[PDB]
């Protein structure tokens, strides 16, 4: 029947894509990982030989450094830090902040995510629909002053996504002193709800407590990018759902 | 009009929820963060005084330890590691694997996510719909052998979610030697597409290369949990979309 055939066809393509991606990633990163591992030991062996660090005390230093990594960025559990953590939790980003060490805190975070994810999803969907309607109205007005097809809507949405990504990359490069490609990759990771791209904002020189304007701009940009992504998904992906 | 009223009403509730969550998180974690910071310095100050570590060379040790953290789990860019990374990328988890250090690799990952996210979403939606249909058929057969309402479907879905979460928590506690609550929290984080909860599996004693059965079971459990979550979202959340 149609349902079973569709499901079986969908399963196979995903597995094939997974295999292809895994093979390409392995073939592209095996040598780099080997070189990085070789360099890092050599360096750690040299420094341990120079400083005569005992094996037993070496693990304690690693644990202390790993546990103190979030604390380097300042006080992450302030009002701004808590707001950023809540934003990441509700938007299913889940990176940049430090996981709470309290069982009650973990339970509260679980309940918060459960009660907040559908609301955020519905709000994003509604705002994306409103943005799509506004874009359609603007296109109709432009055509009248100078019948809209989908392809035009798809092209407009893609151009808007590219422009937003470029603007965010430029802003983050000017603020975080990052490369243009690295800033673009970080913006893409943030807007795709992945969360981890080996980069994080609002974690340098205590920017969470001394630059409220930067935090507000980052939050507004994140919200705008998420709304644009949701609108694009509604335009191109949601038709194939039901 | 209805559209604008809905759009403006959703935003206010979302902002109020964000403020409440941030306030609660701050009030619950400020003291814990302060105590952890105090303990970690005291320890680092004591160890630096004991070993007489120079300030200039201290940063190099931190950089080496931070860069070598993924490498401590073995060769992460093998076939199993690449498959795990691809699974995390397509499922918008984005945690458990080190980010690639190559610009070409980053571009390939971006293209992979772009071309794979809608396909995975559609496959999950279709499989969740099939699971919902099968559950409805089973409930109808049970009622006949011993007219189904929604509330019954919602209760059945919630019970299935709780059972799957408990089974996953028990399995991870028996395998990863974690606490029951910690395993439950990790399973909830994984199934909610958050990704980071300070707990990561398949990263101990090289389990990615010596326990293929464990990796296969973990992948199957992740897929089953994601399918169940998608089915629940279709049952309760998707009606309010369109
Ligand atoms: C077991 C767990 C997953 C339950 C999760 C609860 C959700 C199913 C609830 C909680 C908050 C609810 C929302 C709270 C507020 C609103 C605004 C409400 O808007 C109006 O009443 C005015 C506009 C209109 O008429 O639609 C529409 C429903 C909605 C999105 C609700 C939809 C259903 C939500 C997401
Ligand atoms: C027609 C449309 C598409 C253009 C959109 C306007 C942007 C080009 C503007 C609007 C908001 C601006 C941002 C508002 C606030 C800031 C913080 C500002 O930070 C500081 O001044 C302190 C840090 C430092 O010293 O650089 C740096 C510029 C930036 C990112 C601005 C960069 C330019 C932005 C993105
Ligand atoms: C038309 C709609 C989209 C308007 C939405 C309003 C936002 C522009 C406002 C409403 C609440 C504001 C936030 C309320 C509280 C704070 C805490 C504030 O932190 C501090 O003042 C202390 C730390 C520091 O100094 O940065 C930083 C800005 C921020 C995140 C604000 C950023 C801008 C927000 C999101
Ligand atoms: C600019 C970016 C966002 C483009 C993203 C591409 C997607 C819009 C495409 C890529 C893969 C496509 C899917 C590839 C395979 C199929 C199986 C296909 O199933 C059948 O042909 C049999 C069942 C039936 O008759 O519907 C239905 C469409 C679907 C889900 C496609 C829907 C549209 C997808 C997600
Ligand atoms: C009726 C339904 C609801 C029950 C579903 C059956 C589960 C209780 C079974 C099915 C698959 C089983 C798993 C299959 C494989 C493994 C790997 C296995 O690992 C090893 O044997 C090596 C590691 C070690 O030494 O413990 C540990 C048990 C576990 C998690 C099993 C635990 C019990 C599971 C989840
Ligand atoms: C009805 C449907 C859901 C069936 C789906 C099939 C899966 C049960 C199979 C198909 C491909 C399999 C994977 C193919 C390749 C590998 C690599 C394999 O790794 C190795 O053999 C080397 C490393 C090690 O020793 O673990 C570990 C299992 C895994 C992930 C397999 C896990 C089980 C998978 C996902
Ligand atoms: K995520
Ligand atoms: K996500």
From Swiss-Prot, chains A, B:
Where is this protein found?
Cell membrane; Mitochondrion inner membrane; Cell projection, Dendrite
Q: How does it sit in the membrane?
A: Multi-pass membrane protein
Annotated stretches, region: Selectivity filter 2: 193-198
Q: Where does K(+) 1 bind?
A: 92-93, 193-194
Grouped into one coarse class, the protein's main location is membrane
Record: residues binding K(+) 3: 94-95, 195-196
Provide the catalytic activity annotation: K(+)(in) = K(+)(out); Na(+)(in) = Na(+)(out)
Q: Which domain of life is it from?
A: Eukaryota
Please list where the region (Selectivity filter 1) is annotated: 92-97
Gene Ontology CC: one annotated term: dendrite
Residues carrying the site annotation pH sensor: 97
Q: What is known of its domains?
A: Each subunit contributes two pore-forming domains 1 and 2 which assemble to form a single pore with M2 and M4 transmembrane helices lining the central cavity and M1 and M3 facing the lipid bilayer. The transmembrane helices are bridged by the selectivity filters 1 and 2 carrying a signature sequence TxTTxG(Y/F)G(D/H) that coordinate the permeant ions. Up to four ions can simultaneously occupy the selectivity filter and at least two elementary charges must translocate across the filter to convert it into the open conformation.
As a miscellaneous remark, the entry gives:
Overexpressed in a high proportion of breast cancers. May confer resistance to growth factor deprivation and hypoxia, thereby promoting tumor cell survival in poorly oxygenated areas of solid tumors.
Q: What does this protein do?
A: K(+) channel that conducts voltage-dependent outward rectifying currents upon membrane depolarization. Voltage sensing is coupled to K(+) electrochemical gradient in an 'ion flux gating' mode where outward but not inward ion flow opens the gate. Changes ion selectivity and becomes permeable to Na(+) ions in response to extracellular acidification. Protonation of the pH sensor His-97 stabilizes C-type inactivation conformation likely converting the channel from outward K(+)-conducting, to inward Na(+)-conducting to nonconductive state.
* Assembly, per entry: Homodimer. Heterodimer with KCNK1. Heterodimer with KCNK3.
Q: Which family does it belong to?
A: Belongs to the two pore domain potassium channel (TC 1.A.1.8) family.
Protein name as catalogued: Potassium channel subfamily K member 9
Query: What gene is it encoded by?
Result: KCNK9
What stretch of the complete protein does the chain hold? 2 to 248 of 374
């Amino acid at each position: 029947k149609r349902q079973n055939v569709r499901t079986l066809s969908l399963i196979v393509c995903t597995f094939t894509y997974l295999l292809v991606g895994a093979a390409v990633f392995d073939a592209l990163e095996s040598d780099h990982e080997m070189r990085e591992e070789e360099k890092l030991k050599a360096e750690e062996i040299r420094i341990k030989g120079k400083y005569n660090i005992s094996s037993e005390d070496y693990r304690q230093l690693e644990l202390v450094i790993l546990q103190s990594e979030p604390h380097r960025a300042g006080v992450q559990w302030k009002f701004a830090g808590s707001f950023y953590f809540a934003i990441t939790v509700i938007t299913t980003i889940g990176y940049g902040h430090a996981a709470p060490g309290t069982d009650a805190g973990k339970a509260f975070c679980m309940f918060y995510a459960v009660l907040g994810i559908p609301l955020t999803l519905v709000m994003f969907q509604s705002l994306g629909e409103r943005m799509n309607t506004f874009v359609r109205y603007l296109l109709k007005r432009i055509k009248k002053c100078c019948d809209v097809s989908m392809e035009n809507m798809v092209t407009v949405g893609f151009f808007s996504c590219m422009g937003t990504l470029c603007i965010g990359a430029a802003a983050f490069s000017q603020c975080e002193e990052w490369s243009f490609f690295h800033a673009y990759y970080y913006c893409f990771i943030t807007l795709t709800t992945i969360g981890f791209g080996d980069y994080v904002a609002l974690q340098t020189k205590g920017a969470l407590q001394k630059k409220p304007l930067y935090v507000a701009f980052s939050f507004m940009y994140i919200l705008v990018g998420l709304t644009v992504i949701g609108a694009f998904l509604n335009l191109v992906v949601l038709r194939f759902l039901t």
